[PDB]
Amino acid sequence: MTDRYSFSLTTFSPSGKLGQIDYALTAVKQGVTSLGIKATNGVVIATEKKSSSPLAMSETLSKVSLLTPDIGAVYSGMGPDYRVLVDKSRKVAHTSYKRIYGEYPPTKLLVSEVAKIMQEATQSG
Amino acid sequence: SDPSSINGGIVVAMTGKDCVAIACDLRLGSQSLGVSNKFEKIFHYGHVFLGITGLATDVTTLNEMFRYKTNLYKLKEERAIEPETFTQLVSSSLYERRFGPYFVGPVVAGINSKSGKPFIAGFDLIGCIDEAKDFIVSGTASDQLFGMCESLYEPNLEPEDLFETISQALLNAADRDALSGWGAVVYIIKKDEVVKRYLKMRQD
Amino acid sequence: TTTLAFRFQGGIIVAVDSRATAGNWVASQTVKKVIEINPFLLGTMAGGAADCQFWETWLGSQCRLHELREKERISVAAASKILSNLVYQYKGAGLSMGTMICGYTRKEGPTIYYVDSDGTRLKGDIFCVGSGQTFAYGVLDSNYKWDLSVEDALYLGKRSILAAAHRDAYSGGSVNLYHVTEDGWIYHGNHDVGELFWKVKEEEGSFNNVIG
Amino acid sequence: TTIVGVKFNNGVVIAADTRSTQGPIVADKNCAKLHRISPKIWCAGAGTAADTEAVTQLIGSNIELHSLYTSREPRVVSALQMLKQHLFKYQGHIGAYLIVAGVDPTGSHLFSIHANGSTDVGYYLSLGSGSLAAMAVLESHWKQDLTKEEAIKLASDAIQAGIWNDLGSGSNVDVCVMEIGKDAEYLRNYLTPNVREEKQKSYKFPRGTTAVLKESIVNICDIQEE
Amino acid sequence: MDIILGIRVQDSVILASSKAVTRGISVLKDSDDKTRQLSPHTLMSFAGEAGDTVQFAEYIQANIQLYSIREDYELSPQAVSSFVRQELAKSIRSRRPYQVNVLIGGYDKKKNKPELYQIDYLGTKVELPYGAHGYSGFYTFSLLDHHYRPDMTTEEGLDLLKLCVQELEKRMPMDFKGVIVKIVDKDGIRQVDDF
Amino acid sequence: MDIILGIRVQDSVILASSKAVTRGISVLKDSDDKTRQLSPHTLMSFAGEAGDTVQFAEYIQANIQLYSIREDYELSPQAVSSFVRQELAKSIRSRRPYQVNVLIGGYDKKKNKPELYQIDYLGTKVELPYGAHGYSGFYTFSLLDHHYRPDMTTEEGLDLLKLCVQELEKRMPMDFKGVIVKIVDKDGIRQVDDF
Amino acid sequence: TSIMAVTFKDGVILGADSRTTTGAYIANRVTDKLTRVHDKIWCCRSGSAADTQAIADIVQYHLELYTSQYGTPSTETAASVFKELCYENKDNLTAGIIVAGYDDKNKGEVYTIPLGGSVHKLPYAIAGSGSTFIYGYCDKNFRENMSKEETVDFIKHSLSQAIKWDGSSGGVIRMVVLTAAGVERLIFYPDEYEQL
Amino acid sequence: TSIMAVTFKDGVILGADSRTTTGAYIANRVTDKLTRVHDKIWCCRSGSAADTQAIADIVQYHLELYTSQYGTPSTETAASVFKELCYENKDNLTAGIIVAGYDDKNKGEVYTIPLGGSVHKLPYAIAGSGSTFIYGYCDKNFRENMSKEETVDFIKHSLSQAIKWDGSSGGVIRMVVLTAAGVERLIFYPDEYEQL
Amino acid sequence: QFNPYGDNGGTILGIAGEDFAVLAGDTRNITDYSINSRYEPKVFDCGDNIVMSANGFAADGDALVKRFKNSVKWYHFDHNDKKLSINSAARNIQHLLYGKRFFPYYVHTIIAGLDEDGKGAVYSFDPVGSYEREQCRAGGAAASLIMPFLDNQVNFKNQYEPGTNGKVKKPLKYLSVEEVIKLVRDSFTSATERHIQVGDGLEILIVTKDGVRKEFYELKRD
Amino acid sequence: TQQPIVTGTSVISMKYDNGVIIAADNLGSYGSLLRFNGVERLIPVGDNTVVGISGDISDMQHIERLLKDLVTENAYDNPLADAEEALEPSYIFEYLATVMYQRRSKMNPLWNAIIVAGVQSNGDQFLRYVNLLGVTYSSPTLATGFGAHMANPLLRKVVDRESDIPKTTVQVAEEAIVNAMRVLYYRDARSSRNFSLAIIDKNTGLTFKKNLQVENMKWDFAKDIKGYGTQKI
Ligand SMILES: [Cl-]
Ligand SMILES: [Cl-]
Ligand SMILES: [Mg+2]
Ligand SMILES: [Mg+2]
Ligand SMILES: [Mg+2]
Ligand SMILES: [Mg+2]
Ligand SMILES: [Mg+2]
């Protein structure tokens, strides 16, 4: 065994394109529409609960997730990828910030941490 | 032998009306031998002030460490760190060395730039926060400082009255401690001006 | 603690600091470290405060009994030896004493004996005892002459204690000066180190390392 | 330090004194010893103050993440299990002695935990240097089916016994009440029986009393434009 | 080893270091040079536990020389002393700490100023007009406190240093076999071969 | 105290004793005479624990002087050394023993012979052509073993003694501040005031 | 601590006092020292409370995972898991555990695991500081194949004496009965057992 | 060592094992630990053999001199003399002595003098290393005013259990009966008491 | 191993005025973290217008005071009822203390009264008998909290006259008995706040030419 | 220097309006072994004093004999031995305190903590403590060992200062003492259920109560307590 894939699966093509990122964006394009609007005294995020079956209880599937008491997230694309990102985002808000400064991270810095995790899946082996 | 009383020294901090004060002696020694009369124990990162008593090598190391961390904080946050936030950072940083600690007695002083509220805090060598409303003391003459502050202090002192109170608290405490003295500095801190005063005191 | 005594043309200068400490805590700044054994003899306090006080007062009583019996002033040699023989009896029990027995008689002239709790008894010209002794020796050794005037000798003793008071954490408070003549000792006042330091710094130009 | 926990009809109450000491010296006269693990799980700590704070915040952090992961409100038994396994691993070197209390979907709970990682169940508990004074009061006045008002009274009386009789305890009484189906109410300085009397004299100095060598403005602002 | 002294005068830094190397019962050497040139205008003297002193000093020397080659530039005395302090502060919490105390005498070519730094084995750094390690300060500081002036010439510094060594030779129980004296100024480092 | 040496030549005994008195950190005196004249033709040098050395020496001196007055007669060096040995042998099993080592240099007027006795604090006595106490013998005995002759003059003894002191000053870590040298012969005891 | 487990005709019964001391202070006078590691496999704990709780929690985990894969474990298997933890970590543990359980094939079984981490299968076992005072009594009064009522009396009388003489033991006498019928908890108060 | 003294209707009986150990070696397997200090005042000895022999010899001397002057001493008086020696020399002694005697006025009496040198008058007493294992048994089985045969059985059964569990106890069970009728010595061998 | 010593806490304070002297002490007696008594007198009138307190280990403290009171009694018997002067009492106490030099009274002793000129006097002793006449002396647990405050407020240390900026010291003007008592009360109130062994009550003995007077004040009981 | 072997635990006491109450259990422990169950640790001296002793029992028995000898000695050549020249509580205490301090000063202490409770000739309450170090103190409530930590807090709720003494009846005081003895039985591992209690009143004299027992104990709540955390059965 051992993970013997220690090389990048995303690489530059002759035209300078990173194929796997483009294809990931294509998967996002197929995803259900979600949106966000910023007001003076608040922000709203919204999406459609596209239920896969009417027997499914769509209230048990949360597309909009609390990351911190003052930060929320919504997505378009692959649901399972989102779910694990939410788990990592919630944890990193504690490990790399709240356990150090005794307060929750500002929006831009939590976004930065999530972005870093997504960048690494674009270069790591 | 006791690491917290090899070099000697003291820090005291007080709150007043729309102001804070932090003060320290200037002595560094090797037990009985006086080595330096210019060893300042108060540092600042933006508008947040940090006094550190105890083992001098750790005092220097921690100053460099908190300069390091507050500089990265500022680059990422795009703003200066506040006293309340910095207090947590000091606590976190000390407790990470729980079983091999820095032998220090840190003291935070400053005014929150948004609320304007005066803030002071103290720590033991392992990160426990003492957030007193009135005053914080630290060092080899902390008993003496507790005695001075408890009788001399009264709330809501004006900046120039607070200066006299904290100065007399430091001076008379230091004169009853063999390992403290050799000069003293007092910072008077207001929301957007800080004044630094070196005091004249006995040099034995 | 810093105590010194030195012989010179005009007799003996005795100079001491005034600080007593218990660990880092400064117990007193007003300790009398010169013990007036009688009007002609002085002893210095170092080591154990009680041991020095008690046994040097006792020495004064023995000196008084000697001169009542012999109708003659006791010699510094005899007086110092009464003390050294006494503490030698107690050797091992834990007495702590480092003292200079100082006197000026006809037969001896100005005489200083270093007496010590492990039984040592040394006659000498310059002695310095305490935690700040090394600092005071420096000033003494480089400025001492036999032909010092009483005025200059008094200042040298004062300046040497000040040197120790500055650097040694356990020395300070104030300086006590004595001048021992053949007709008895003369007290030359108490001098607060805080005020003395600034005065000496300005007048002498020394301590440029210190901002004043 | 005196800390107690008392079970009652529809919940649990914890209380603590407000004195923290180095040796014989009082470091802080109004210390906060009631720590929040989660909204309705609170605990009080005795022993090494940094350890009681740190272990609370670590488990409190992990409890919050666990609550988000499972979409369920945290349980006291989870906090207890995580605390004891952490403390046992460090073989008593983390000097945290805690009384852990709270309400959750399972009901109301009260546990004690020692620094080596041993745990206890009870209707009334006390910890710290004043625990014997507090337990004397608890053993004299505790009964089954206490009301909320009776439990608050008993808890604060037990802390008072510590305040007055134990030199390690003093100043004020802090209380936190956790009732089933309600918000936990934190009552900071519930009792204040130790206010210092007015001093005989004002020690405010005349301005210019202190001798000053130098004055200067400290630049706290960043490097300026132009 | 034993006595190391330093004095910063108007235009130079002077380091004096004893020559004796004693292994318990016998004095094995009486011409030992307890110093290393870190860069053309920076000198470091040292004292402490046997073996560790030279090992530490040569390790620092190798690092500063490496920096000089990489950047084609001489680090300031302040920068060198900070590097040395960090190494010792790192060392004190190691498995086996370096038991080494140092004095760093350098001439800053940018500021045109001499600089003397005193650093003990814990990583305790202070900039001083004059300094020492061990018991050396106990005998010499009262003399330096009295006579020192910031505008002293190199010759006056050497004369004050002689008075300090004389007091050491009088009151110290150990025979340290005299001192090697080196001067650090704008022209670099040189040894006073008659002292 | 520290170094005490003795050498018996043709017609005299020469005792050399260091001048330093050190109380831990500082050298308190550099002219101390570590010897007592027991009788006109008998000298005793001494080293050991502070206080006890002088106390013991003066006690012995008082006893020998008492014997001299009672009998109007000077005891032989052998008799004095036997008396001293017994006092130390008695002392070693006391509540608090005298920690004192001695050399006894005497000229026997009956036999017309110089005599040197070495006695340590245990009461171990040996008659020797040359002797020492402490570490003094470790540095000097190889030189004495080589150069010593039983028919040496007093001047040759002093020259061999100078070579011994020079070797001590070179290889010993402690500064003992030179030695006081005294000669014991048929005419009594005298001090060499330039050495 | 006074603890014991006794096999009888219908299975096994575990017994324990309820006193936990810190020196001469009784830190808990109503302790439950009878511990469930599986439905019908329990244990009595003595020694370090931290250690015996840590061990018991790990055993309970092991037997829960065993049950999910291989079905109900035997009492011997449970004792083996206890022994493995106690023997391999003997340098860092102060634990004296009695393991008692009921199978339908094997019926009531008792295993004692003293300080060293050895295992001893016995008809009955006694342990804890208070056990020293009842070696004579228990040896004289134990019989094999007693009834439930006789075994309850034997344990009640035994622990009564252990409590009487041992300062480290006291409070209530707790008991857990393990048979084919199920699991029954019993409690006996001072006013009952002190007059025996 | 396992020693005991028990008062009964007609007087008092002393009992003891016969094992004396040096570490794990049995230096004497037939020791007589029941010692006569007066005609009808005996004692059981535990602790340092040197100390308890020295004490007993001094007591015997004291009671012999008492008798010559004041007539037969009481058992209380004998206990007092034992106590005086044990209390005043507590720093230098390791002795645990049970004193038993028969008066006609007072009948059977038992006094125990533990390590500290205190005195305790009791209906019966147990001491020695082996006694720890029979506190439960003796407390449950002792009755006041037993017959001679019952008391012999009580002591035989008690010491049997003490011997069974204590390695420092063993050999034969010796007994001395003190009544108005006189002084009777009894001995019981392993093959007798081991099967009880 | 048997430890013949203990620590009963407590804090005492002696201040010498111009024609009076006060000796004050808290009334709390403790061991470890327990309170033995909230009112156990620690400052004693010993006769001849002398007041005394031996703070530290209370058994040695009681023994010393008892032996000194006895010494006063026998001084009267042996010397025709002569009044024992404060300086004579002080020298006598040195000999009582030094008599046990190698098994000391584990106490810090302070006596107060008037000298033979009618001026206020305070003497301070270490455990083995070294002594000195002093103007101001705190003893015991909270001595380190009290002395710096007294240096500042009694002797006006580090205080200079406004406008001169360090050139002219604040002049050492004499304090009245009412002024001293204010500083004593504030010293003990502050010590009570920050030291766990100080509290319950404060008893002050005031010595004048008219005799010895007592004053009591409550302190915080936590 | 020694070590205690057979020991007695807490002695507790308090003042009330007309006298004093003192109590102590009847146990003589041998380490953790509850060896002797009928030990009287309150020893009356005359009809006005009761001395309560904790710690080493052999030393207690020695002190008991000293007090017995003290009564005999006081009666010698004393026609008023049962009147004006009878032993006072203050005489008995001062004698014991002298002995205790002398013994610790020879480095050979009587390993005890002692409380002397009584009523003086003039009707004044006497209550004072002395221990192996010779340390003495007085207080409205006094207790030794565990009693100091657990009984005092409870007893101080009844008499918190001197002025509370005249407001405290003998019924309220005895109730408080008896409750404290119950609390000590719950929480002290070296205590017993059986105890003695003595009341010395200026009107009704010395009332000595033997064979008292701790009663009204709460244990029922123990039945609901299961496991040490997660266990439900
Ligand atoms: Cl076993
Ligand atoms: Cl026993
Ligand atoms: Mg100072
Ligand atoms: Mg100084
Ligand atoms: Mg463990
Ligand atoms: Mg029990
Ligand atoms: Mg307090």
Which CATH number covers residue B126?
3.60.20.10
Taking CA–CA distances from E151, the nearest residue in chain C reads C208
In total, chain I counts a number of residues equal to: 222
Q: Tell me the domain boundaries of chain C.
A: 1-212
CB contact under 8 A, I148 and B168: no
User: What Å distances lie between residue J16 and B6, D182, G10, CA to CA?
Assistant: 55, 47, 60
Residue in C131, C194, C209 closest to B204 by CB? C194
Task: Give the one of H91, H116, H132 whose C-beta lies nearest to J57's C-beta.
Answer: H116
**Which among E8, E37, E30 has a CA at the least distance from the CA of E176?**
E30
Element (H, E) at G183: strand G182-188
Q: Which residues contact G85 (CB under 8 A, 6 or more apart)?
A: G55, G58, G59, G93
F114: β partners? F107
Whether the CB of D61 is below 8 Å from some CB of chain A: the reply is: yes
Contact C138 E150 (CB under 8 A): no
Buried b (16+ CB within 10 A) or exposed e, B171-192: bbbbbbbbbbbbbbbbbbbeee
Task: List, by residue number, the catalytic residues of G.
Answer: 1
Residue type, J62: H
DSSP 8-state code for residue I160: B
Judge contact between H84 and H58, C-beta under 8 A.
no
Pairing of strands F125-127, F113-119: antiparallel
Residues of H catalogued as catalytic:
1
Pairing relationship of beta strands H182-188 and A65-68 according to DSSP bridges: unpaired
**Residues G44 and G97 sit within 8 Å (Cβ to Cβ):** yes
Residue H10's domain spans which residues?
Answer: 1-196
What residue spans define the domains of chain D? 1-226
- Spatial contact of H98 and H127, defined as CB atoms under 8 Å apart: yes
Angle between helices J146-156 and D131-141 (to 10 degrees): 60
Q: Across the interface, which of G25, G30, G53 has its CB nearest the CB of D119?
A: G53
Positive or negative CA dihedral for H58, H59, H64, H66?
Answer: positive
CA distance E83 to chain C (A): 26
Which residue in I has a C-alpha nearest to residue J146's C-alpha? I34
The whole-angstrom separation of Cα F193 and Cα F178 is 12
Resolution of this entry, Å: 2.9
CA-CA distance, H134 to H173, in Å (whole number)? Answer: 15
CB contact under 8 A, I40 and J107: no
What backbone phi and psi angles, to 5 degrees, belong to G34?
-95, 115
> Rounded to 5 degrees, what are φ and ψ at H51?
-65, -45
Q: How far apart are CA G193 and CA I128, in angstroms?
A: 60
Minimal C-alpha gap between I54 and chain D (Å): 21
Is the CB of residue D127 less than 8 Å from the CB of residue D115? Answer: no
How far does G164 lie from chain H, in Å, by closest CA? 9
Provide the chain J residues 71-130 that lie in CB contact (below 8 A) with chain I: 101, 104-105, 107, 109, 129
Residue B202 near residue C17 (C-beta atoms within 8 A): no
Give B124-127's long-range contacts (Cβ < 8 A, gap of 24+).
Answer: B124/D22, B124/D49, B124/D50, B125/B4, B125/B54, B125/B94, B125/B101, B126/B94, B126/B95, B126/B97, B126/B98, B126/B101, B126/D48, B126/D50, B127/B90, B127/B91, B127/B92, B127/B93, B127/B94, B127/B95, B127/D50, B127/D54
Q: Is C128 on the interface with F (CB under 8 A)?
A: yes
The shortest CB-CB distance from C91 to any of F23, F51, F54 is to: F51
Domain span holding position F173: 1-195
DSSP string for residues in J203-228:
TTEEEEEEEEE--S---GGGGG--SS
Q: How far is C172 from chain E (nearest CA, A)?
A: 15
Residue B13 CA to ligand 3 center (angstroms) comes to 19
Antiparallel, parallel or unpaired: β I29-31 and I34-37: antiparallel
**CA–CA distance, I32 with I8 (Å, rounded to integer):** 8
Q: Is C49 annotated as a binding residue?
A: yes
Contacts of residue F171, Cβ cutoff 8 Å, sequence gap at least 6: E26, E27, F139
Q: Searching chain J, which residue's CA lies closest to the CA of residue H118?
A: J58
In angstroms, the Cα distances linking J160 to B87, D83, J16, J139, J140 are 43, 40, 12, 10, 8
String of b and e for G97-113 (b: at least 16 CB within 10 Å)?
Answer: bbbbbbbeeebbbbbbb
CATH number for F56: 3.60.20.10
From D214's Cα to the closest Cα of chain C, the distance in A is 10
| Fold category of C1-212 in CATH | Glutamine Phosphoribosylpyrophosphate, subunit 1, domain 1 (3.60.20)
- What is the rounded distance in angstroms from the CA atom of residue A49 to the CA atom of residue F185? 123
Distance in angstroms (rounded) separating the CA atoms of residues D206 and D218: 25
Q: Which of G1, G21, G22, G61 to mutate against chain J (most J CBs within 10 Å)? A: G21
Q: Within 10 Å of residue F155's Cβ, how many Cβ atoms? A: 9
Question: Is I137 in contact with I110 (CB distance < 8 Å)?
Answer: yes
CB contact under 8 A, E118 and B39: no
The count of CB pairs under 8 A between chains C and F is 39
Facing residue for C122 by CB, picked from F29, F49, F55: F29
User: What pairs with residue C47 in β-bridges?
Assistant: C97
Q: Do B161 and D22 touch (CB under 8 A)?
A: no
Whether the CB-CB separation of I46 and I65 falls below 8 Å is answered with yes
Burial class from Cβ neighbours inside 10 Å (0-12, 13-18, 19+) for residue C143 reads middle
CA distance D207 to chain A (A): 40
Which residue range(s) make up the domain with B18? 1-204
Return the structure tokens found at E169: 């030779």
Could you give the CA distance from residue C42 to residue C30 in angstroms, rounded to a whole number? 18
Chains touching chain H, criterion 3+ CB pairs below 8 Å: G, J
Residues in chain D, overall count: 226
Whether the Cβ atoms of residue D32 and residue D189 lie closer than 8 Å to each other: no
Query: Which of E8, E143, E144, E146 should be substituted to probe chain C, the one whose Cβ sees the most C Cβ atoms within 10 Å?
Result: E146
**Ligand nearest to the backbone CA of I28:** 7
User: What is the residue type of A50?
Assistant: K
Any chains having at least 3 CB pairs less than 8 A from chain G are D, H, J
Superfamily of domain J1-233: Aminohydrolase, N-terminal nucleophile (Ntn) domain (3.60.20.10)
Find all residues with CB under 8 Å of J83, minimum gap 6, and list them: none
CB pairs under 8 A between A and B: 18
- The minimal CB distance from I102 to the residues C25, C49, C93 is found for C93
Helix C49-70 to helix C76-89 angle, to the nearest 10 degrees? 130
Residue H109's domain is classified under what CATH number? Answer: 3.60.20.10
CB-CB under 8 Å, B151 with D203: yes
φ/ψ (deg, to 5) at J202: -70, -15
Whole-angstrom distance, CA of residue G22 vs CA of residue D112 = 14
Ligand 4 center from residue B159 Cα (angstroms)? 32
Q: At which residue do the structure tokens 């309705």 appear?
A: D40
CA–CA separation, B127 vs B92, rounded Å? 7
- Domains of chain I (ranges plus CATH)? 1-222 (3.60.20.10)
Size of interface D-J (CB pairs under 8 A): 56
3-state SS class at F24: coil
Bridge partners of F18, per DSSP, are F179
Cα distance between residue C197 and residue C184, in whole Å = 30
Provide the residues around ligand 3 (an ion) whose CB is within 5 A.
B 174, 177, 181
The token pair that represents D19 in the structure block? 């004195």
**Chains F and C make contact, 3+ CB pairs within 8 Å:** yes
Q: Which residues pair with F16 in a beta bridge?
A: F5, F181
Contact D206 I162 (CB under 8 A): yes
Ligand 2 centroid, distance to H120 Cα (angstroms): 9
CATH architecture of the domain with residue range D1-226: 4-Layer Sandwich (3.60)
Q: Do residue D61 and residue A66 have CB atoms under 8 angstroms apart?
A: no
Ligand closest to Cα of G54 equals: 5
Residue owning tokens 């009393």: D209
How crowded is residue F178: how many other Cβ atoms within 10 Å of its Cβ?
17
8 A C-beta contact, residue E138 and residue E168? no
